[PDB]
From a paper:
To understand how CD59 blocks membrane insertion of C8α we solved the structure of the C5b8-CD59 complex in a lipid nanodisc. Using 3D classification of images we resolved an equimolar complex consisting of a single copy of C5b, C6, C7, C8, and CD59. To improve the resolution of the C8-CD59 interface we subtracted density corresponding to C5b, C6, and C8γ and focused our alignment on the region of the map composed of C7, C8β, C8α, and CD59, enabling us to resolve the central β-sheet of CD59 and unambiguously define its orientation within the map. In the C5b8 inhibited complex, helical bundles of C6, C7, C8α, and C8β are fully extended, with CD59 directly binding the leading β-strand of C8α TMH2. Within the C8α-CD59 interface, the C-terminal β-strand of CD59 forms a contiguous antiparallel β-sheet with the MACPF domain of C8α. The interaction is initiated by a salt bridge between CD59:E58 and C8α:K376, which is located on the leading edge of TMH2. Next, three consecutive glycine residues on C8α (C8α:G375, C8α:G374, C8α:G373) encode flexibility in the strand curvature and enable the β-strand bend observed in our map.
CD59 is an abundant immuno-regulatory receptor that protects human cells from damage during complement activation. MAC assembles from the stepwise association of five complement proteins: C5b, C6, C7, C8, and C97. Though unable to bind soluble C8 or C9, CD59 directly engages both proteins within the nascent MAC to trap C5b8 and C5b9 assembly intermediates.
Author numbering:
A (entry chain E): 368 to 408
B (entry chain E): 215 to 218, 239 to 262
C (entry chain B): 395 to 408, 412 to 443
D (entry chain G): 1 to 77
E (entry chain D): 194 to 200, 215 to 242
F (entry chain C): 200 to 248
G (entry chain D): 346 to 390
H (entry chain C): 349 to 397
The structure:
């Protein structure tokens, strides 16, 4: 009854990059309370 | 598309592009 | 607000006829609100 | 449909199978060497869907009518 | 746009057009000096 | 101190409608609708202490 | 007989530049270390 | 027979808003303890006196 046809070209190109970098350094003050400031400002 | 058989031609062309940039810097 | 609607019909025969409507409407609303509060205090104490 | 089925590239899909539902079209697809045949679904001839399911980007296909229509050489070239 | 004509003949001609534009710009500035 | 606040809205719409049917062994209909809206809102505040 | 013809054309160009720049300098001179530091925090005291 | 029906729309919106909020304060003290001076001269915006 019917004949059905097609064709074509598909293209995808991707570039994706994510960088996360945190430094939290505390010099001076006691180990515990400098560590507390290092962890949670 | 034409009919007297009935017969069709269809054409498609597309370019879909997406770009995103997100930069956060904080120094204390 | 205004509505202004007019209508005319005509026919003539030994044949031609016209029936016709044209009408136009206007609406307006202005709304106004205003407030002004002013005040002063002095206090001199010795 | 009762189609030839080859979900994986097969340059001469002769794998006729009794997916013998009556009223519905088959698929033939040629993507160069990447030739495919399926007990496809009727009510379809969408290039984007074929590229999706068959994972092919240059393919040529027919949604050929009803039963046994879809032997591998029905696509010329 | 929509056009039709006929006699035995038919001739249908439709058109659509859209030109939608959005243009937004917000700025905030704060200067806070304490001494 | 003074605290001052103004608020204004002007809403206007204008519309036109037309119909015209004619018969003279040739038949015709003709119709036009035209609508215009202009809407303005202004709010103004000055506060001094 | 019938012959039909048609075109659809479409564009959606959308751009969304967004930026924040925040500079805070705190200077504290004199007093005890404890108060000097907590004054040197980023919030007003 | 011949028929033709033609439509146009042309909506437009334009909004603009500006704020300026300037606050200035200069508590000044002579005399009294340095700590009471700094405590009192520190401007509390909810109670500026
Ligand atoms: C221009 O067109 C857009 C898209 O239709 C309009 O945004 C719609 O507005 C209605 C009424 O406010 C909302 O119900 C829809 O949810 C909106 N759609 C989107 C995707 O935001 C916009 O209002 C139009 N602009 C003008 C000035 O008429
Ligand atoms: C930092 O401290 C706050 C307040 O005590 C708390 O709500 C938060 O969860 C803490 N976060 C971390 C990582 O310790």
């Amino acid at each position: 009854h019917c004949k059905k046809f097609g064709g074509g070209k598909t293209e995808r190109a991707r570039k994706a990059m994510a960088v996360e970098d945190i430094i939290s350094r505390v010099r001076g003050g006691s180990s515990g309370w400098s560590g507390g400031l290092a962890q949670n400002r | 598309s034409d009919s007297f058989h009935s017969q069709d031609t269809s054409f498609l062309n597309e370019l879909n592009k997406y770009n995103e940039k997100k930069f956060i810097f904080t120094r204390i | 607000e205004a509505k202004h609607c007019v209508r005319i019909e005509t026919k003539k025969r030994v044949k031609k006829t016209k029936v016709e409507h044209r009408c136009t409407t206007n609406k307006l609303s202005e709304k106004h609100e205003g407030s002004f509060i002013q005040g002063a205090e002095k206090s001199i104490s010795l | 449909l009762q189609c030839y089925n080859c979900p994986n590239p097969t340059a001469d899909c002769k794998t006729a199978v009794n997916c013998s539902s009556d009223f519905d079209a088959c698929l033939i697809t040629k993507a160069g060497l990447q030739v495919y045949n399926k007990c496809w679904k009727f009510e379809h001839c969408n290039f984007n869907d074929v590229t999706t399911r068959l994972r092919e980007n240059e393919l040529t296909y027919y949604c050929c009518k009803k039963d046994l229509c879809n032997f591998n050489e029905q696509l010329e070239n | 746009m929509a056009s039709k004509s006929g006699f035995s003949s038919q001739s249908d001609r439709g058109k659509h057009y859209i030109r939608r534009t959005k243009r937004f710009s917000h700025t905030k500035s704060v200067f806070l000096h304490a001494r | 101190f003074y605290n001052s606040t103004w608020s204004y809205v002007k809403h206007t719409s204008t519309e036109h409608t037309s119909s015209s049917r004619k018969r003279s062994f040739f038949r015709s209909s003709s119709s036009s609708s035209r609508s215009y809206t202009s809407h303005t809102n202004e709010i103004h505040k000055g506060k001094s202490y | 007989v019938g012959k039909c013809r048609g075109i659809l054309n479409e564009i959606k160009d959308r751009n969304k530049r967004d930026t924040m720049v925040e500079d805070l300098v705190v200077l504290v001179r004199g007093g005890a270390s404890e108060h000097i530091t907590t004054l040197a925090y980023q919030e007003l005291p | 027979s011949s028929h033709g029906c033609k439509e146009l729309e042309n909506a437009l919106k334009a909004a603009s808003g500006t704020q300026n909020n300037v606050l200035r304060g200069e508590p000044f003290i002579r005399g009294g303890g340095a700590g009471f001076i700094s405590g009192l001269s520190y401007l509390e915006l909810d109670n500026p006196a």
